[PDB]
Amino acid sequence: TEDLVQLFPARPRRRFSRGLKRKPMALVKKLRKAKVRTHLRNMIIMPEMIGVGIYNGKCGHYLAEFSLSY
Amino acid sequence: WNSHPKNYGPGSRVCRVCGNSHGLIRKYGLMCCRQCFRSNAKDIGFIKYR
Amino acid sequence: QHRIRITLSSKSVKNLEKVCSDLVRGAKDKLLRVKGPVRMPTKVLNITTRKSPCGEGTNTWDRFEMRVHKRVIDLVSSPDVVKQITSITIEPGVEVEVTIS
Amino acid sequence: GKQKIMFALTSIKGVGRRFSNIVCKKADIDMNKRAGELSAEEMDRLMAVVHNPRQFKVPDWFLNRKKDYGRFSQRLKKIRNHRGLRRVRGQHTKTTGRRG
Amino acid sequence: MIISKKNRNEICKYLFQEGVLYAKKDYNLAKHPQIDVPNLQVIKLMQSFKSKEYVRETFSWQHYYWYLTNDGIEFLRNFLNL
Amino acid sequence: QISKKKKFVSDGVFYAELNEMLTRELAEDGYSGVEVRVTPMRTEIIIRATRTQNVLGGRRIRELTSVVQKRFNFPENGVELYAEKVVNRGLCAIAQAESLRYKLLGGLAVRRACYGVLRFVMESGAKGCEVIVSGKLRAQRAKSMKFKDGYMISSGQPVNEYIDAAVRHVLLRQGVLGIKVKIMLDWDPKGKLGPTTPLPDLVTIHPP
RNA sequence: GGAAGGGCACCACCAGGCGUGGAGCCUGCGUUUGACCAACACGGGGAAACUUACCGGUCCAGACAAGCAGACUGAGAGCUCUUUCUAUGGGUGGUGGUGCAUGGGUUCUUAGUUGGUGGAGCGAUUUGUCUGGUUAAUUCCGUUAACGAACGAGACCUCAGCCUGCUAACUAGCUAUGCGGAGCCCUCCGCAGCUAGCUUCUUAGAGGGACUAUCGCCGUUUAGGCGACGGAAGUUUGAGGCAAUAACAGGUCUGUGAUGCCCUUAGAUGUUCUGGGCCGCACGCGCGCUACACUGAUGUAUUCAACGAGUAUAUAGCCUUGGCCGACAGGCCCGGGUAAUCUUGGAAUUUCAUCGUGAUGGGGAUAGAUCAUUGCAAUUGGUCUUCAACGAGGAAUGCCUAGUAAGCGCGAGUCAUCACUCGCGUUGACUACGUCCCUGCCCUUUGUACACACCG
Numbered sequence A: 001t002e003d004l005v006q007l008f009p010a011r012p013r014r015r016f017s018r019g020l021k022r023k024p025m026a027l028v029k030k031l032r033k034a035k036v037r038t039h040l041r042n043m044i045i046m047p048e049m050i051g052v053g054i055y056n057g058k059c060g061h062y063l064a065e066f067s068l069s070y
Numbered sequence B: 001w002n003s004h005p006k007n008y009g010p011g012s013r014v015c016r017v018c019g020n021s022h023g024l025i026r027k028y029g030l031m032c033c034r035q036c037f038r039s040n041a042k043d044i045g046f047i048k049y050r
Numbered sequence C: 001q002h003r004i005r006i007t008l009s010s011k012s013v014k015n016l017e018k019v020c021s022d023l024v025r026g027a028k029d030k031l032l033r034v035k036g037p038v039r040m041p042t043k044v045l046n047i048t049t050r051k052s053p054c055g056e057g058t059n060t061w062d063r064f065e066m067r068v069h070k071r072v073i074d075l076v077s078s079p080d081v082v083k084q085i086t087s088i089t090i091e092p093g094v095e096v097e098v099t100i101s
Numbered sequence D: 001g002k003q004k005i006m007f008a009l010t011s012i013k014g015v016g017r018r019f020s021n022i023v024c025k026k027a028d029i030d031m032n033k034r035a036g037e038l039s040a041e042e043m044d045r046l047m048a049v050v051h052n053p054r055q056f057k058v059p060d061w062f063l064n065r066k067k068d069y070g071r072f073s074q075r076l077k078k079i080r081n082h083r084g085l086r087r088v089r090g091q092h093t094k095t096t097g098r099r100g
Numbered sequence E: 001m002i003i004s005k006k007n008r009n010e011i012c013k014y015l016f017q018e019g020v021l022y023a024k025k026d027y028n029l030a031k032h033p034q035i036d037v038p039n040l041q042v043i044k045l046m047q048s049f050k051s052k053e054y055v056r057e058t059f060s061w062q063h064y065y066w067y068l069t070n071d072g073i074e075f076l077r078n079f080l081n082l
Numbered sequence F: 001q002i003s004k005k006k007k008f009v010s011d012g013v014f015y016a017e018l019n020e021m022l023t024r025e026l027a028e029d030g031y032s033g034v035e036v037r038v039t040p041m042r043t044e045i046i047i048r049a050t051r052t053q054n055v056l057g058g059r060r061i062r063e064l065t066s067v068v069q070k071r072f073n074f075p076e077n078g079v080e081l082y083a084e085k086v087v088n089r090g091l092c093a094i095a096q097a098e099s100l101r102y103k104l105l106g107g108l109a110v111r112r113a114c115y116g117v118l119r120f121v122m123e124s125g126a127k128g129c130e131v132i133v134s135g136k137l138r139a140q141r142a143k144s145m146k147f148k149d150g151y152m153i154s155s156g157q158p159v160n161e162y163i164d165a166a167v168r169h170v171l172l173r174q175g176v177l178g179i180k181v182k183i184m185l186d187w188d189p190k191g192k193l194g195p196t197t198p199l200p201d202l203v204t205i206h207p208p
Numbered sequence G: 001g002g003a004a005g006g007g008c009a010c011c012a013c014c015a016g017g018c019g020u021g022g023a024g025c026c027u028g029c030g031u032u033u034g035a036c037c038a039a040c041a042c043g044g045g046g047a048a049a050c051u052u053a054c055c056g057g058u059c060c061a062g063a064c065a066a067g068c069a070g071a072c073u074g075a076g077a078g079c080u081c082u083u084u085c086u087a088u089g090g091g092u093g094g095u096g097g098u099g100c101a102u103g104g105g106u107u108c109u110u111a112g113u114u115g116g117u118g119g120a121g122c123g124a125u126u127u128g129u130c131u132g133g134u135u136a137a138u139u140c141c142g143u144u145a146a147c148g149a150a151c152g153a154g155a156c157c158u159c160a161g162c163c164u165g166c167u168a169a170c171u172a173g174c175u176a177u178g179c180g181g182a183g184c185c186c187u188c189c190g191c192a193g194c195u196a197g198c199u200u201c202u203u204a205g206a207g208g209g210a211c212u213a214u215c216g217c218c219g220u221u222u223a224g225g226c227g228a229c230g231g232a233a234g235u236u237u238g239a240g241g242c243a244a245u246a247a248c249a250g251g252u253c254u255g256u257g258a259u260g261c262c263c264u265u266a267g268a269u270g271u272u273c274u275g276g277g278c279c280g281c282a283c284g285c286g287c288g289c290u291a292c293a294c295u296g297a298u299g300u301a302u303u304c305a306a307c308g309a310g311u312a313u314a315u316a317g318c319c320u321u322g323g324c325c326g327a328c329a330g331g332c333c334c335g336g337g338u339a340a341u342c343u344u345g346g347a348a349u350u351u352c353a354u355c356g357u358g359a360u361g362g363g364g365a366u367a368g369a370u371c372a373u374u375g376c377a378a379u380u381g382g383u384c385u386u387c388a389a390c391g392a393g394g395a396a397u398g399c400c401u402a403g404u405a406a407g408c409g410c411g412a413g414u415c416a417u418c419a420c421u422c423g424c425g426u427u428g429a430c431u432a433c434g435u436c437c438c439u440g441c442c443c444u445u446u447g448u449a450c451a452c453a454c455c456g
């Protein structure tokens, strides 16, 4: 997963170079095994899962786009 | 329990005297809120001159 | 031999001045050259804070201000006689530091 | 027409002061004359410089439309993006927005 | 609050050999300022002895301080069966 | 190592912490300040009390000496802490402050307690005294009541060395009562009574 | 009091300087709340996580004192598994209410307030505390049924302003010489001389200096005032700190292990984390930032400050010097400073030119593409493109009299990242030096059917 982040925008490049937490691989393992109810939205979209639902706090981009609370 | 990273921010620093999370003065490492610090200014050695 | 530097740190001018004169004259007792006293530039700590515990009322700020005074003495002598001279009594508010110079 | 070529090409979209500067000096064109003096023997050179930035040694960052979603060069509503739908910058719009 | 035998032993030894107690109101600090015990355990144990008259308290600037008496030392001897 | 500014701030806040800790433990004895000095290899911290025979109890003083050694991570055999008697109980502002607090807590009427304290401060030899009690005494409405006499300056630089003031918040049965005591000190050239300098308005004349 | 006199004030005016209200911007008030001259960049309140008081699961932080590897979830959090907590009695936490139960303002920056004895009145009360002349002043001289006194003012303290006087400076400087650098000398840059000499230049201490003294006039021959020489200073020199009595149902229970009462005290109103929200917007108002351009933008090239702050050495959390790489944003190496040593060698303005009066190169709102830093997790900063309103702003409205206003930056607080407030310095003026006309404040006389006191 080097060419993709290489032509990804600056923010995905920096964030993926900065490392990942445990919940990211927990999420990807759950997604590939199931092949969506978590509240986390700070995963920059890679072409892995191209093919929704996040807690809004009341009920090449992050998942911090569809989390609209009002 | 306290899983959120408290390495910085008002969630880690409190007034040494009282314990508020607001009004924290930090200059010269005072580590106290303005009310408590103004209460003990004479005690610390902080005296008005002008 | 083995020049010795003593630093005198305080907040009160009178105590520092009297103890500095006392120490310099004591060094002069042993017939010893003393370069000084050197009056280190005073350093000021300024802090401003709002009196009102709650922001209600016109904003009035008090300005606490502390002064730190310092003197430095260099004595071209063996350290033992420096310790002998400084071994005499002291007054409150003055801190004595000794270093090899 | 009458404005200097330094800022005569500011009018055409996609080109401002910076690209006008990058084109009026990379074709070895005179700079202290107006556009009305400019004739056809240098208009073709100007368009060649403008239309072919990378081949003319334009610094790669200078191009405005950079690395499209995939080539350095000089939809949001449909994909349901907060940027296309929306202020996107996240502004304290409690007071502003009084234009209608 | 549940307390292990070894931890209570260590707290008692610290209270006996060095009969002065101080503590900081920070259970996130998993080590008591001198002994490796977590702060919460020793604080709750002391608050348990608080109503037992064996120690007297003084709280100054978010800091617990605890002061000993004859009942405290005799309780320590009774628990340790010295 | 530690810079001078941080160290000075640390000792200032440490002295404030020591004052707060000692004033909330010697309520039965009348803690009346502390003097701290740093001699070569020794850090002396002498506590003051109106009643000293009860501070000694001298084992408890040794426990309170270990208190600063181990709580503040001070080195052993480098810190000393003893107790001392007040030169003048009445002339000390905090002494009469907690004396009035104790008197009102015991069951005496507040008015009589302040009259007694007011007589005691003139027994000491104060130039003037002032006692202000604010809060609810008997009624739901709170009131401010004062007893003052003698010389009572109110402004200028001389206010911060020619007077001694103390303020306390005594927790009563029905609430918290605020007490303030202010004592004027006369000119003692030696300096044992009050200030060592005369007042700007006080001028002495040598007869011809 | 839309009554008569006296006095004072750029939070009042006259004479002006800048402005606000008009444009865009951001920030507060009218998805936690407090606050209505004296709320509205205020709660030091510039909230990505907590702060948090508003809206899923979780432990008991119920102390003291009758009875014993599977699935769901965001999260093997909890439930399957392990293992030797209760029924009360009650305690802790509560940013839950009560600031009208309480404790710990730009009333009033004005000069005012009160005992003791004495005099007058049956008494509330009154004189002292005042006809008059002065003062910033209830400051003083005097008058005097008052005399003698307490506060406030003054006095006091801090800083700046002057010292070719003193004290003494290798963590600060000045000069000469010697050496090296260039055009012997002379112009000239750098380096030493453990004393070349000195403290004139910077630092910091003791001191001095100004007290209205002399000159004239005025006033009473007082108190003092005006104009003069001199002097650094003739306004107590300027600017501040402190600042009396009496109150507000002024603010704060959401600063306080300050606290009384009511309420939760276990499907907890605390506690721990997850996410959101306070950042809403058709709309009204409030404090400031950026402009309307040619007195300018833009591009070259001269260059003059103060205040303060700056490390845990883990490779290294702070200030960062220098070298290298990178258009810039940013990265690696050499390292210094726990500090007068190192950062610290510290802009408008000013010669020169392209603009050329055009909403134009004034202006950059707003957008897209893009790189990287901070942060655990996106805030900001680089490049180009986009180029909105805006051509001195109605009623109203705020600040200010000298290095002041106005203009330009710097530091600190805020801070893992992001600048309004507190100080610092730079350039540097117009008018006024009068008054109570308006807005107030103070005193005396007077009127009153008010006393919650004319919002009567």
Ligand SMILES: [K+]
Residues within 6 Å of the ligand: B020, B022, B023, B024, B033, B034, B035, G255
């Ligand atoms: K606070």
Ligand SMILES: [K+]
Residues within 6 Å of the ligand: D093, D094, D095, D096, D097, D098, G281
């Ligand atoms: K709007």
Ligand SMILES: [K+]
Residues within 6 Å of the ligand: G020, G021
């Ligand atoms: K305007």
Ligand SMILES: [K+]
Residues within 6 Å of the ligand: G042
């Ligand atoms: K404000």
Ligand SMILES: [K+]
Residues within 6 Å of the ligand: none
């Ligand atoms: K109050």
Ligand SMILES: [K+]
Residues within 6 Å of the ligand: none
């Ligand atoms: K009388």
Ligand SMILES: [K+]
Residues within 6 Å of the ligand: none
């Ligand atoms: K030479």
Ligand SMILES: [K+]
Residues within 6 Å of the ligand: G252
């Ligand atoms: K309070």
Ligand SMILES: [K+]
Residues within 6 Å of the ligand: G253
């Ligand atoms: K409460």
Ligand SMILES: [K+]
Residues within 6 Å of the ligand: G364, G387
């Ligand atoms: K623009």
Ligand SMILES: [Mg+2]
Residues within 6 Å of the ligand: D009, D010, D011, D012, D013, D014, D015, D016, D017
């Ligand atoms: Mg263009």
Ligand SMILES: [Mg+2]
Residues within 6 Å of the ligand: F153
């Ligand atoms: Mg006085």
Ligand SMILES: [Mg+2]
Residues within 6 Å of the ligand: F155, F156
């Ligand atoms: Mg005064």
Ligand SMILES: [Mg+2]
Residues within 6 Å of the ligand: G010, G399
């Ligand atoms: Mg004004």
Ligand SMILES: [Mg+2]
Residues within 6 Å of the ligand: G009, G010
């Ligand atoms: Mg004014």
Ligand SMILES: [Mg+2]
Residues within 6 Å of the ligand: none
């Ligand atoms: Mg006018």
